[PDB]
Design a protein around this nucleic acid. Structure first.
Lengths: 132, 380, 61, 96, 62
RNA sequence: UUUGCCUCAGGGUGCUGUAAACAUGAAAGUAAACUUUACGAUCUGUUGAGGCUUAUCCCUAGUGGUAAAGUGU
RNA sequence: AAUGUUAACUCAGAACUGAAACGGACAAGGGGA
């Protein structure tokens, strides 16, 4: 319930399509916006692991298609720095469908998941499938 | 008419004009103030560019998300070839600024310091400071009595010794360092002892205090607007090139404003970095100052593989947070902070965990020569 | 390339990736048909020379 | 004439110039170094010397050629450049 | 001090320098810098990789 | 501008990375004589060793050179 | 029924090998509704 949310490395601008890797029924997300982004002239909003991202579904169940939803981007392809003296980065670009309050709408995520959202929203800690 | 999308301007007007600095050393506009209650001691220092490196630590800030967990930080270690104190200068306040009452030199002076007063030393008769160091002490006593009666700001001419450093330069850099503290009556006796000897940094520099760094940034010659102020590149379709500001002002006023970014010199500017807290005190000859009792390996301030464009370091070291400006072999100036604070990190006591020894040039593999030799052993 | 011709007869560069022309570009298929017709027709004439085959099966074959 | 043992490193002299003028830059640097070191203005190269640094090509002249140079009395002073060829350069210090 | 061992190579890890590469399967893969990760990233074999101690272990040249 | 400096070299940290040869060695398997005899992308042991490494890398009272002093006050 | 002289470039499968990469340069269609 604390928002000590730690530095993040910036990547995945608006207009990127990424994998879903969950049983929500979606296949690929399409980033349309991220929250917490302020006002810069030509800056494209881009995703952070601990930030919700407004996204659409391009392939998947018609139930969750044709509309905007919130997704937690879990696995990045850019090295994010940490006080541990060592960045972290992945190959799959992935995000999990969540409700605006924060909790995950799916049941399990196939690949590794981000631990920061587990304590940002307490209902993701219980459902964390296989954290790196 | 108005802009449809208002956005912040480019660059800061507070660093104008973006022109080449007149000198190489870092001048000081302002020294930290003085108080009657506080005791008379030193007020600044100087040295060179030893390193702006990392160190591993552990935060003690309550409620921090890292806190107990080990962290990595960024601090600096200073190069201090001891400065020789050679001169004393008195200043008195007047409605026209603080004016020099007089300066007094040490009865014996170094050759490196005197070499600075020349442009062709190899061809001169080295006659500077020859017959000016044979004055009676009655004049000195009278003038220091005058200093006590009239002067209110006391500064010490100190000069570095580049012979210790691997620099090609043989002239000594000369500056003046303020002395801050109590009243004149105590100050007179407190400034009667150190008038000739060289300067050890650990004399006043203490852990858990804030300092500032003064230097001259690197140089790049003339550069375009896109580099000097980071203006937006024009679209590729632009006729007479794209690396320029499109509109340099409206029709009226019928002149180019001074706020318009233009091409010119970037770099070789005067820079001061504030809020740089000092953390630890060490030496040059000793063998375990940088390392800790939890590290139990062998190493001193010594680097590995040489320093790229800096040679080797054979002088003192301390610890202080941050990174520095300038280039290699560039003189750096160290000031104390102006107004000390009582905030949590302002009074925070600190302690390190591990100290780097590695090949600071790029991606190396061995932190120490002993490790490199041992890990292979029998070879060609 | 004399040694290379020996090596291509040896059979290393027989890969399908040194061919910058079509089948008919390397060798003329019409000329191949002409050559085949000539070589089988010489035999067909020699069969009549030796009378090994009769004309009734000769026009057939 | 005077007996001296040095070499010349054309790598550090043609490091900055483009391929099109690497060999002529090497020639010019050799001439300049010979004249400057031997305190004379009339330095005449040799056809063999031109051959040696043009043979490897314009893109890459030979990196290093050893100099043990002799003058000639006949304004009056003039020099002709010469070279020493050896397999390995490591271990061969400069001297008289 | 305690420093863990490298995954691809056998060198100790010094905090303040490294990064982390993880594949799809989520297994931890710890290295030291971009080369120490990219040698594995370019789908090459440490047995063939001559200039690492893994090749020495494979070719019994201790 | 002679406890310097330029050049060169002894190295050093390095970079690619394994370098110049040997093979009654293997060398996919090939062909010529009455078991041996003519090639064969590579490695194996010398080879975690060469080539390059300041021109804007580091150290060396290591040695070669370091020159005409022309102008103004 | 068979054994001797003398001129092709088209296919095919077993190898291992090379930094798992190759019409190696030059030369050359982006497709679809």
């Amino acid at each position: 319930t604390l928002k000590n949310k730690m530095r993040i490395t910036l990547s995945l601008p608006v207009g990127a399509l990424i994998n879903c890797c969950d049983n929500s029924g979606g296949k690929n997300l399409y980033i349309i916006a991220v929250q917490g982004f302020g006002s810069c002239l030509n800056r494209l909003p881009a995703a952070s692991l601990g930030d919700m991202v407004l996204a659409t579904v391009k392939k998947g169940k018609p139930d969750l298609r044709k509309k905007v939803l919130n997704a937690i981007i879990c696995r990045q392809s850019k090295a994010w720095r940490r006080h541990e003296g060592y960045y972290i980065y992945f190959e799959d670009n992935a995000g999990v469908i969540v409700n605006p309050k924060g909790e995950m709408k799916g049941s399990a995520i196939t690949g590794p998941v981000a631990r920061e959202c587990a304590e940002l929203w307490p209902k993701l800690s219980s459902a964390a499938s296989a954290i790196v | 008419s108005h802009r449809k999308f208002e956005r912040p301007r480019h660059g800061s007007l507070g660093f104008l004009p973006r022109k080449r600095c007149k000198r190489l050393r870092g001048k000081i506009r302002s020294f930290p103030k003085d108080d009657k209650e506080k005791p008379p001691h030193f007020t600044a220092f100087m040295g060179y560019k030893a390193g702006m490196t990392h160190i591993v630590r552990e935060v003690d800030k309550p409620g921090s998300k890292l806190h107990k967990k080990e962290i990595v930080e960024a601090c600096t270690i200073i190069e201090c070839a001891p400065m020789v104190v050679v001169g004393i200068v008195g200043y008195r306040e007047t409605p026209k600024g603080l004016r020099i009452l007089s300066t007094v030199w040490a009865n014996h002076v170094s050759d490196e310091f005197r070499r600075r007063y020349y442009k062709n030393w190899y061809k001169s008769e080295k006659k500077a400071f020859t017959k000016s160091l044979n004055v009676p002490e009655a004049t000195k006593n009278c003038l220091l009595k005058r200093i006590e009666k009239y002067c209110t700001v006391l500064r010490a001419i100190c000069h570095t010794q580049p012979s210790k450093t691997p620099l090609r330069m043989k002239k000594a850099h000369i500056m003046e360092v303020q002395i801050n503290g109590g009243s004149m009556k105590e100050k007179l006796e407190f400034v009667k002892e150190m008038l000739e000897k060289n300067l050890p940094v650990s004399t006043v520099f203490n852990p858990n205090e804030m300092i500032d760094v003064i230097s001259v940034t690197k140089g790049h010659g003339t550069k375009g607007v896109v580099s000097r102020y980071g203006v937006k590149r024009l679209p590729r379709k632009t006729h007479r090139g794209l690396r320029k500001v499109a509109c340099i002002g409206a029709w009226h006023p019928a002149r180019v404003q001074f706020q318009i970014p233009r091409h010119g010199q970037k770099g070789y500017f005067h820079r001061t970095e504030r809020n740089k807290k000092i953390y630890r005190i060490g030496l040059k000859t000793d063998k375990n100052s940088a390392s800790t009792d939890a590290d139990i390996t062998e190493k001193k301030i010594t680097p590995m593989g040489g320093f790229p464009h800096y040679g080797v370091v054979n002088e003192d070291f301390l610890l202080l947070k941050g990174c520095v400006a300038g280039t290699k072999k560039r003189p750096i100036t160290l000031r104390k902070n102006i107004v000390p604070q009582v905030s949590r990190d302002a009074l925070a006591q600190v302690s390190l965990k591990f100290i780097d020894t590695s090949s600071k040039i790029g991606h190396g593999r061995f932190q120490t020569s002993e490790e490199k030799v041992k890990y292979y052993g029998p070879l060609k | 390339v004399r040694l290379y011709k020996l090596a291509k007869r040896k059979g290393r560069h027989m890969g399908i990736g040194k061919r910058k022309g079509t089948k008919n570009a390397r060798t003329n298929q019409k000329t191949l048909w002409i050559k085949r017709q000539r070589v089988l027709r010489r035999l067909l004439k020699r069969l009549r020379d030796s009378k090994k085959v009769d004309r009734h099966l000769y026009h057939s074959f | 004439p005077v007996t001296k043992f040095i070499t010349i490193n054309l790598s550090k002299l043609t490091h900055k110039v483009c391929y099109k003028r690497k060999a002529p830059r090497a020639i010019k640097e050799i001439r300049s170094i010979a004249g400057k070191l031997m305190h004379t203005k009339d330095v005449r190269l040799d056809v063999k010397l031109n051959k040696f640094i043009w043979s490897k090509g314009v893109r890459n002249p030979p990196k290093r050629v050893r100099v043990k140079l002799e003058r000639k009395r006949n304004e009056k002073m003039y020099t002709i450049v010469e070279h020493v060829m050896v397999d390995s350069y490591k271990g061969l210090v400069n001297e008289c | 001090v305690k420093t863990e061992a490298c995954s691809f190579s056998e060198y100790r890890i010094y905090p303040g320098r490294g990064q982390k590469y993880i594949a799809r399967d989520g297994k931890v893969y710890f290295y030291l810098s971009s080369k120490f990760a990219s040698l594995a990233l370019q789908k090459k074999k440490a047995a063939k990789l001559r200039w690492t101690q893994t090749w020495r272990r494979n070719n019994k040249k201790t």
